[PDB]
Protein backbone atom coordinates (compact mmCIF):
# COMPACT_ATOMS: atom_id res chain seq x y z
CA UNK A 1 0.00 0.00 0.00
CA UNK A 2 2.84 2.34 0.93
CA UNK A 3 5.23 3.42 -1.85
CA UNK A 4 8.96 2.65 -1.51
CA UNK A 5 11.15 5.64 -2.46
CA UNK A 6 14.94 5.47 -2.59
CA UNK A 7 16.91 8.70 -2.47
CA UNK A 8 20.33 8.53 -4.11
CA UNK A 9 22.29 11.57 -2.92
CA UNK A 10 25.73 13.22 -3.08
CA UNK A 11 16.49 16.07 5.68
CA UNK A 12 13.42 18.19 4.89
CA UNK A 13 12.71 16.28 1.69
CA UNK A 14 12.63 12.91 3.43
CA UNK A 15 10.36 14.42 6.07
CA UNK A 16 7.85 15.82 3.58
CA UNK A 17 7.72 12.59 1.53
CA UNK A 18 7.11 10.52 4.66
CA UNK A 19 4.40 13.06 5.43
CA UNK A 20 2.82 12.11 2.09
CA UNK A 21 2.57 8.42 3.02
CA UNK A 22 5.76 6.97 1.57
CA UNK A 23 8.58 4.88 3.00
CA UNK A 24 11.84 6.67 2.37
CA UNK A 25 15.25 5.03 2.12
CA UNK A 26 18.50 6.95 1.55
CA UNK A 27 21.71 5.98 -0.26
CA UNK A 28 24.57 8.44 0.11
CA UNK A 29 26.82 7.35 -2.75
CA UNK A 30 26.16 6.42 -6.38
CA UNK A 31 27.83 3.02 -5.90
CA UNK A 32 25.59 2.24 -2.93
CA UNK A 33 22.64 3.67 -4.83
CA UNK A 34 23.24 1.35 -7.77
CA UNK A 35 23.58 -1.70 -5.55
CA UNK A 36 20.44 -0.86 -3.56
CA UNK A 37 18.30 0.03 -6.58
CA UNK A 38 19.13 -3.14 -8.51
CA UNK A 39 18.91 -5.45 -5.50
CA UNK A 40 16.15 -4.02 -3.29
CA UNK A 41 13.59 -2.96 -5.95
CA UNK A 42 12.02 0.28 -4.59
CA UNK A 43 9.00 1.74 -6.42
CA UNK A 44 10.81 4.94 -7.36
CA UNK A 45 14.30 6.48 -7.43
CA UNK A 46 14.90 10.12 -6.59
CA UNK A 47 18.39 11.04 -7.80
CA UNK A 48 19.53 14.21 -6.01
CA UNK A 49 22.46 15.45 -8.12
CA UNK A 50 22.95 18.77 -6.34
CA UNK A 51 25.32 20.43 -8.80
CA UNK A 52 24.84 19.12 -12.41
CA UNK A 53 27.62 16.66 -13.22
CA UNK A 54 28.43 13.73 -15.53
CA UNK A 55 28.68 11.05 -12.83
CA UNK A 56 24.91 11.40 -12.57
CA UNK A 57 24.42 10.49 -16.23
CA UNK A 58 26.62 7.41 -16.00
CA UNK A 59 24.69 6.40 -12.89
CA UNK A 60 21.37 6.53 -14.78
CA UNK A 61 22.80 4.46 -17.65
CA UNK A 62 24.28 1.97 -15.17
CA UNK A 63 20.99 1.64 -13.32
CA UNK A 64 19.03 1.14 -16.54
CA UNK A 65 21.23 -1.84 -17.32
CA UNK A 66 19.80 -3.45 -14.20
CA UNK A 67 16.35 -2.02 -13.49
CA UNK A 68 13.35 -0.27 -15.02
CA UNK A 69 12.33 1.51 -11.79
CA UNK A 70 11.23 5.14 -12.42
CA UNK A 71 13.91 7.75 -11.78
CA UNK A 72 13.25 11.42 -11.01
CA UNK A 73 16.28 13.72 -10.96
CA UNK A 74 16.65 16.77 -8.71
CA UNK A 75 19.40 19.35 -9.21
CA UNK A 76 20.35 22.77 -7.82
CA UNK A 77 20.81 24.39 -11.24
CA UNK A 78 18.90 24.38 -14.52
CA UNK A 79 21.07 23.26 -17.43
CA UNK A 80 19.08 22.10 -20.46
CA UNK A 81 21.83 19.90 -21.92
CA UNK A 82 21.96 17.88 -18.69
CA UNK A 83 18.21 17.40 -18.61
CA UNK A 84 18.32 16.13 -22.18
CA UNK A 85 21.29 13.94 -21.32
CA UNK A 86 19.64 12.50 -18.19
CA UNK A 87 16.25 11.86 -19.78
CA UNK A 88 17.80 10.18 -22.84
CA UNK A 89 19.82 8.05 -20.42
CA UNK A 90 16.60 6.60 -19.04
CA UNK A 91 15.41 9.04 -16.38
CA UNK A 92 11.66 9.75 -16.16
CA UNK A 93 11.54 13.32 -14.87
CA UNK A 94 13.88 16.13 -13.82
CA UNK A 95 13.23 19.12 -11.56
CA UNK A 96 15.83 21.83 -11.02
CA UNK A 97 15.69 24.38 -8.21
CA UNK A 98 13.69 26.42 -7.65
CA UNK A 99 10.80 23.96 -7.35
CA UNK A 100 7.89 23.38 -4.97
CA UNK A 101 7.28 20.27 -2.90
CA UNK A 102 3.74 20.32 -4.27
CA UNK A 103 4.98 19.94 -7.84
CA UNK A 104 7.55 17.31 -6.90
CA UNK A 105 4.85 15.25 -5.16
CA UNK A 106 2.52 15.59 -8.13
CA UNK A 107 5.31 14.36 -10.42
CA UNK A 108 6.01 11.40 -8.12
CA UNK A 109 2.35 10.43 -8.40
CA UNK A 110 2.53 10.57 -12.21
CA UNK A 111 5.58 8.31 -12.20
CA UNK A 112 4.00 5.76 -9.87
CA UNK A 113 0.68 5.47 -11.73
CA UNK A 114 2.38 4.95 -15.10
CA UNK A 115 4.05 1.90 -13.52
CA UNK B 1 34.25 -22.50 3.51
CA UNK B 2 32.70 -23.68 0.23
CA UNK B 3 32.98 -21.15 -2.63
CA UNK B 4 32.55 -21.06 -6.43
CA UNK B 5 34.81 -18.98 -8.72
CA UNK B 6 33.31 -16.57 -11.23
CA UNK B 7 35.25 -14.68 -13.88
CA UNK B 8 33.56 -11.47 -15.01
CA UNK B 9 34.59 -9.95 -18.33
CA UNK B 10 33.39 -6.35 -18.21
CA UNK B 11 34.87 -3.03 -19.30
CA UNK B 12 32.77 -0.73 -17.10
CA UNK B 13 34.24 -0.07 -13.63
CA UNK B 14 30.89 0.80 -12.01
CA UNK B 15 29.26 -2.42 -13.23
CA UNK B 16 32.37 -4.43 -12.40
CA UNK B 17 32.11 -3.15 -8.80
CA UNK B 18 28.35 -3.72 -8.64
CA UNK B 19 28.70 -7.31 -9.85
CA UNK B 20 31.59 -8.03 -7.47
CA UNK B 21 29.52 -6.83 -4.51
CA UNK B 22 26.41 -8.78 -5.60
CA UNK B 23 28.24 -12.03 -6.37
CA UNK B 24 30.48 -11.90 -3.29
CA UNK B 25 27.26 -11.33 -1.35
CA UNK B 26 26.07 -14.70 -2.66
CA UNK B 27 29.22 -16.35 -1.38
CA UNK B 28 31.15 -16.34 -4.63
CA UNK B 29 34.78 -15.52 -5.34
CA UNK B 30 35.06 -13.04 -8.19
CA UNK B 31 37.80 -12.49 -10.73
CA UNK B 32 37.59 -9.70 -13.28
CA UNK B 33 39.07 -8.84 -16.68
CA UNK B 34 38.65 -5.55 -18.50
CA UNK B 35 39.19 -6.83 -22.05
CA UNK B 36 38.51 -10.03 -24.02
CA UNK B 37 42.19 -11.01 -24.34
CA UNK B 38 42.86 -10.66 -20.61
CA UNK B 39 39.62 -12.60 -20.16
CA UNK B 40 40.97 -15.54 -22.13
CA UNK B 41 44.18 -15.34 -20.10
CA UNK B 42 42.21 -15.27 -16.84
CA UNK B 43 40.15 -18.23 -18.10
CA UNK B 44 43.39 -20.17 -18.54
CA UNK B 45 45.05 -19.44 -15.20
CA UNK B 46 42.07 -19.22 -12.84
CA UNK B 47 40.09 -22.21 -14.18
CA UNK B 48 36.83 -20.45 -13.21
CA UNK B 49 33.59 -22.37 -12.53
CA UNK B 50 31.69 -19.84 -14.61
CA UNK B 51 32.30 -16.88 -16.91
CA UNK B 52 30.03 -13.83 -17.20
CA UNK B 53 30.76 -12.16 -20.52
CA UNK B 54 29.53 -8.55 -20.63
CA UNK B 55 29.33 -7.64 -24.32
CA UNK B 56 28.85 -4.36 -26.17
CA UNK B 57 32.62 -11.43 -28.45
CA UNK B 58 31.49 -14.41 -30.49
CA UNK B 59 35.18 -14.87 -31.28
CA UNK B 60 36.04 -14.95 -27.58
CA UNK B 61 33.46 -17.74 -27.08
CA UNK B 62 34.71 -19.71 -30.11
CA UNK B 63 38.34 -19.44 -28.99
CA UNK B 64 37.57 -20.44 -25.40
CA UNK B 65 35.48 -23.45 -26.47
CA UNK B 66 38.45 -25.00 -28.29
CA UNK B 67 40.00 -25.77 -24.90
CA UNK B 68 37.41 -25.18 -22.18
CA UNK B 69 33.89 -26.30 -21.37
CA UNK B 70 33.39 -23.67 -18.62
CA UNK B 71 29.80 -22.30 -18.56
CA UNK B 72 29.44 -18.90 -20.21
CA UNK B 73 26.60 -16.44 -19.59
CA UNK B 74 26.34 -13.41 -21.87
CA UNK B 75 25.03 -10.01 -20.76
CA UNK B 76 24.35 -7.84 -23.79
CA UNK B 77 22.80 -4.48 -24.63
CA UNK B 78 21.46 -6.22 -27.77
CA UNK B 79 18.07 -7.94 -27.65
CA UNK B 80 18.28 -9.01 -31.31
CA UNK B 81 17.15 -12.62 -31.70
CA UNK B 82 19.89 -13.08 -34.29
CA UNK B 83 22.57 -12.12 -31.76
CA UNK B 84 21.21 -14.42 -29.04
CA UNK B 85 21.13 -17.35 -31.48
CA UNK B 86 24.72 -16.61 -32.64
CA UNK B 87 26.18 -16.49 -29.11
CA UNK B 88 24.39 -19.66 -27.94
CA UNK B 89 25.29 -21.57 -31.13
CA UNK B 90 28.89 -20.41 -30.67
CA UNK B 91 28.86 -22.05 -27.25
CA UNK B 92 27.39 -19.67 -24.69
CA UNK B 93 25.13 -21.37 -22.15
CA UNK B 94 22.84 -18.41 -21.60
CA UNK B 95 22.16 -14.86 -22.71
CA UNK B 96 20.50 -11.98 -20.91
CA UNK B 97 19.57 -8.65 -22.47
CA UNK B 98 19.11 -5.28 -20.75
CA UNK B 99 17.64 -4.70 -18.26
CA UNK B 100 19.16 -7.71 -16.51
CA UNK B 101 17.54 -8.56 -13.19
CA UNK B 102 20.27 -9.30 -10.62
CA UNK B 103 17.99 -11.87 -8.90
CA UNK B 104 17.37 -13.68 -12.19
CA UNK B 105 21.05 -13.56 -13.14
CA UNK B 106 21.85 -15.12 -9.76
CA UNK B 107 19.27 -17.89 -10.32
CA UNK B 108 20.71 -18.50 -13.80
CA UNK B 109 24.22 -18.66 -12.28
CA UNK B 110 22.95 -21.29 -9.82
CA UNK B 111 21.62 -23.28 -12.81
CA UNK B 112 25.01 -23.18 -14.57
CA UNK B 113 26.82 -24.22 -11.37
CA UNK B 114 24.78 -27.40 -10.78
CA UNK B 115 27.21 -29.97 -12.18
CA UNK B 116 26.83 -33.70 -12.84
The HSE-up count of residue B17 (CA atoms within 13 Å, CB side) is 13
Structural domain boundaries, residue B106 = 1-116
Between CA A90 and CA A72 the distance in angstroms is 10
Residue of A8, A29, A31, A39 for testing the chain B interface, max B β-carbons within 10 Å: A39
CA distance, residue B66 to nearest chain A CA (Å): 31
Provide the number of structural domains found in chain B. Answer: 1
**CATH assignment at residue B20:** 3.40.50.2300
Between CA A7 and CA B30 the distance in angstroms is 29
User: What resolution in angstroms, rounded to 1 decimal?
Assistant: 2.2
Q: Give the residue among B2, B6, B9 at the shortest CA–CA distance from B29.
A: B6
* B17–A38 C-beta distance less than 8 A: no
What does the H/E/C string look like for chain A? Answer: CCEEEEEECCCHHHHHHHCCCEEEEEECCHHHHHHHHHHHCCCEEEEEEECCCHHHHHHHHHHHHHCCCCEEEEECCCCHHHHHHHHHCCCCEEEECCCCHHHHHHHHHHHHHCC
* Alpha carbon separation from B1 to A24, B24, B31, B85 (Å, rounded): 37, 13, 18, 38
Q: Which residues of B touch A8 (CB under 8 A)?
A: none
Provide the pairing of β-strand A44-50 with A93-96.
unpaired
Method: X-ray
Amino acid sequence: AMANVLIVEDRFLRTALEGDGMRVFEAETLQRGLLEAATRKPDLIILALGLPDGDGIEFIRDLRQWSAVPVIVLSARSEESDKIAALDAGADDYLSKPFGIGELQARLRVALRRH
